[PDB]
Amino acid sequence: VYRVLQCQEEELTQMVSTMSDGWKFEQLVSIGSSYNYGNEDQAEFLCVVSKELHNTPYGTASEPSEKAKILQERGSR
Amino acid sequence: GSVSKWVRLNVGGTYFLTTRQTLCRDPKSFLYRLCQADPDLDSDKDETGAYLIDRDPTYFGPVLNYLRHGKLVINKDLAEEGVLEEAEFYNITSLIKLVKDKIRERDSKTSQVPVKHVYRVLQCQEEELTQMVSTMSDGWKFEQLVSIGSSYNYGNEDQAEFLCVVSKELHNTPYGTASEPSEKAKILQERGSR
Amino acid sequence: GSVSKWVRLNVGGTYFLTTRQTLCRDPKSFLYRLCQADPDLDSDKDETGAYLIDRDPTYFGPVLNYLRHGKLVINKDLAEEGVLEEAEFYNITSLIKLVKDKIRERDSKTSQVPVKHVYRVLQCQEEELTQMVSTMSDGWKFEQLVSIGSSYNYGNEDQAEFLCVVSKELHNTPYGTASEPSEKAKILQERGSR
Amino acid sequence: TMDEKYVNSIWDLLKNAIQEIQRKNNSGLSFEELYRNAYTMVLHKHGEKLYTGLREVVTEHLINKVREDVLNS
Amino acid sequence: MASNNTASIAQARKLVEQLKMEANIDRIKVSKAAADLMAYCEAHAKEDPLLTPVPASENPFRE
Amino acid sequence: SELDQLRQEAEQLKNQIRDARKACADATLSQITNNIDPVGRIQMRTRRTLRGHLAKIYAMHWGTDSRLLVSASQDGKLIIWDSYTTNKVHAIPLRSSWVMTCAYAPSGNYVACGGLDNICSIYNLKTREGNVRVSRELAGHTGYLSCCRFLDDNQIVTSSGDTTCALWDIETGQQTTTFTGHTGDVMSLSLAPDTRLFVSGACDASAKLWDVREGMCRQTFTGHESDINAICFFPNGNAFATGSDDATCRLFDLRADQELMTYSHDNIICGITSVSFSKSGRLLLAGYDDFNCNVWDALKADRAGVLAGHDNRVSCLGVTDDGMAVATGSWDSFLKIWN
Amino acid sequence: WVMTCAYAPSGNYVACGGLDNICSIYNLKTREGNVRVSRELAGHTGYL
Secondary structure (H helix, E strand, C coil), X not given: CEEEXXXXXHXXXXXXXXXXXXXXXXXEEECCCCCCCCCXXXXXXXXXXXXXXXXXXXXXXXXXXXXXXXXXXXXXX | CCCCCEEEEEECCEEEEEEHHHHCCCCCCHHHHHHCCCCCCCCCECCCCXXXXXXXXXXXXXXXXXXHHCCCCCCCCCCHHHHHHHHHHCCCHHHHHHHHHHHHHHHHHXXXXXXXXXXXXXXXXXXXXXXXXXXXXXXXXXXEXXXXXXXXXXXXXXXXXXXXXXEECCCCCCCCXXXXXXXXXXXXXXXXXX | CCCCCEEEEEECCEEEEEEHHHHCCCCCCHHHHHHCCCCCXXXXXXXXXXXXXXXXXXXXXXXXXXHHHCCCCCCCCCCHHHHHHHHHHHCCHHHHHHHHHHHHHHHHHCCCCCCCCEEEEEEECHHHHHHHHHCCCCCCEEXXXXXXXXXXXXXXXXXXXXXXXXXXXXXXXXXCCCCCCCHHHHHHHHHHHC | CXXXXXXXXXXXXXXXXXXXXXXXXXXXCCXXXXXXXXXHHHHCCCHHHHHHHXXXXXXXXXXXXXXXXXXXX | CHHHCCCHHHHXXXXXXXXXXXXXXXXXXXXXXXXXXXXXXXXXXXCCHXXXXXXXXXXXXXX | CHHHHHHHHHHHHHHHHHHHHHHCCCCCHHHHCCCCCCCCCCCCCEEEEEECCCCCEEEEEECCCCCEEEEEECCCEEEEEECCCCEEEEEEECCCCCEEEEEECCCCCEEEEEECXXXXXXXECCCCCCCCEEEEEEECCCCCEEEEEECCCCEEEEEECCCECCEEECCCCEXXXXXXXXXXXXXXXXXXXXXXXXXXXXXXXXXXEEECCCCCEEEEECCCCCCEEEEEECCCCCEEEEEECCCCEEEEXXXXXXXXXXXXXXXXXXXXXXXXXXXXXXXXXXXXXXXXXXXXECCCCCEEEEECCCCCCCCEEEXXXXXXXXXXXXXXXXXXXXX | CXXXXXXXXXXXXXXXXXXXXXEEEEECCCCCCCCEEEEEEECCCCCC
């Protein structure tokens, strides 16, 4: 499972040093901005991280819930 | 022999020449009732007096080590699942518990999170880069290098030029997480957070 | 077989036919006393006139190899811990220490801080890039290629335009480290450090 | 699981055989037996138990046999 | 131990000792030590570069 | 039981000790005399800006050569700055996290560190294979390593949590001489230039001075009402200042066995988080929880000067081992060299 | 798809949950120095 952590240069070492157990850091990219390139602003890095799971022998599925589907529809738009 | 100081067992057709006391190590073992000379015994080599047992010589070995020197050590070619099977068959409850514990640690490692990688962000300018990569500490792996745009000097010629993410694995998951309480450490952590 | 100048010993139920001095190599051992005349002994096979000695032949193998030629041997199917405990029972302290160090090496090469891996930063511009990438040496693994930001010579060209970080795993444990006393080496290291 | 049930039995047999060899009984016991019993008990962290038991067994074997003979001499 | 109030007797004994070898050490006069330390400071004033606006090329942080 | 007489003896001995100290308490000459050289205004400028740290820097410790300064950040990163060229001689990522102490060897051949991981790591900088290989991982402490210092390449003192500063033998990977005299967890540790007596500051506010070869608490100075942050010996080894969570710094004298001087002002009120002595010892520079740090005359406690650098607390101080310059480690990740 | 974020009354834990019928409770402050999963509340057959 993969997640994107938007960060700026400052707290970067803070979060990278403080990744949770089982979470493998995968990649880090910079990003420009209207002011300069990134830094001097927020939103200067995207940190893509991953976590290994174990559900292959046990399978994966969605346990039924009608309100869950309603909320998924609401969050899709 | 039927009765002797030493016993000539026959596991899967292979003769184990051991001593009575190794089998008599504990009385909750299948082998203890096997050793005794009592009714309900018709499976033995009647040409030499060897007890012919229908069990594998593969998983009998590590189990026999448990009664020979108090500990079971599995081979690199025999599954700990097989020795668990054999211990459960011989009803060696302590051995069953120990092999279960070993299997629990092994499966906690193998199923997911065998290790918990730790990650660090070195900050290197281009000039020193190669050297501190070359002299980068043993047991750490390079994972990423990223430049940074700067108004000080865009691209090259920067003293914060490169951010090097390195990492290393950590064996704390198969051994279990460790932590102890201390209030001074917690208040210092709170100071550091702000 | 007979027990004589060449001795026939029944380990695990299997006979090893070895030489008297080979076992008499070092006193610190279970087998030293067995080599000597013993009226203290009672569990010996009188059916073939051989000493029935308890302990698996598999882990007794490397012990016998050591006791013949002073060095242990670890198979890829045999447990290092098994020959370790074989050394424990037979009590050869030097062999115990050696097999303990072998287990230490096996664990350290697989430990949370490995001994392997070593990293270099080659530098090339686009023109020579594919050259040193393709010709890059065997056993080395390419790790990452980075460009560099540039305010000098805009367009795809610079004298440090690409940095190629490569690496390779190491096998430092058998060869051994190069860290040993040499004062001139220390002087050179200090001079190059600053 | 409790395991001293056989540890006590092997300890008493071990002390009996030590008394027997001190008695100069040699064709009634196996040196490998006592060897392995001692190693077993060491591996279950009884070193103080082994040491004290050896001390006491050799002590009363001095008392019960040697002292009477020396006094008679 | 617990019968001796959880070995607080050890704590009290330890304090008594530390006070004993504190007493065994003679205290020197405050004026004496102050004079000694200011004498050290003044005799070492010229050899402390922090007390000196050294020339342009005198120290390896501006030289 | 046995406690009553022992505690009564403790009370009477404390009274006797106070009486002895006040009996030898004389008038302090230093603050009285103003005819002895007044410091005057000292305008001071930083020369280097060792940017390159990312987390808050906890401890910084000059090397023996007074050129290589090791600094530890909050994230578990050691930077061995070449103080002349702002060059990372080495950057060591540490297995542990939340390190607060960085101990330089007395030969510049090792670096030791300690954090909330409750383990003291000794790393050999001089591994002949180039890379900084780990030397030892000393474990067995009762808590986090507040601070540690090298006495020898095989002898270290690790002021761990829960009132312990056990002297560790690096060679055997075994501790040698536990020091158990505090009631609050040790928070600082300073070696005398004599390197035979170490003063340990804790959260019991009592700076316990320990003989390093016997395992006994030589002396016990007090006067701070707050936990001791950092201790820095005088260049003599017979006196040392002490800073605590209060804005007060107390210069104690070993021979006098009582507080020689005090150092506090009403303009700034913040815990003294770092204390330093110059080569002469006449200057006492203290880093504050307030972002700036202040240097007083170590003899009149009047303002020698104020260093208006940084924007965060000066988390650590260190003077060169010839007192030519002073490095101010900070929490805004900019170590500043002052000279 | 988490839509709840429960902050502890001490800043010592954080709880969250969503369309997984499991409440994740995390210890922010750990002697290991990093955020860790502390408890996975399972037992709801509906989304938290």
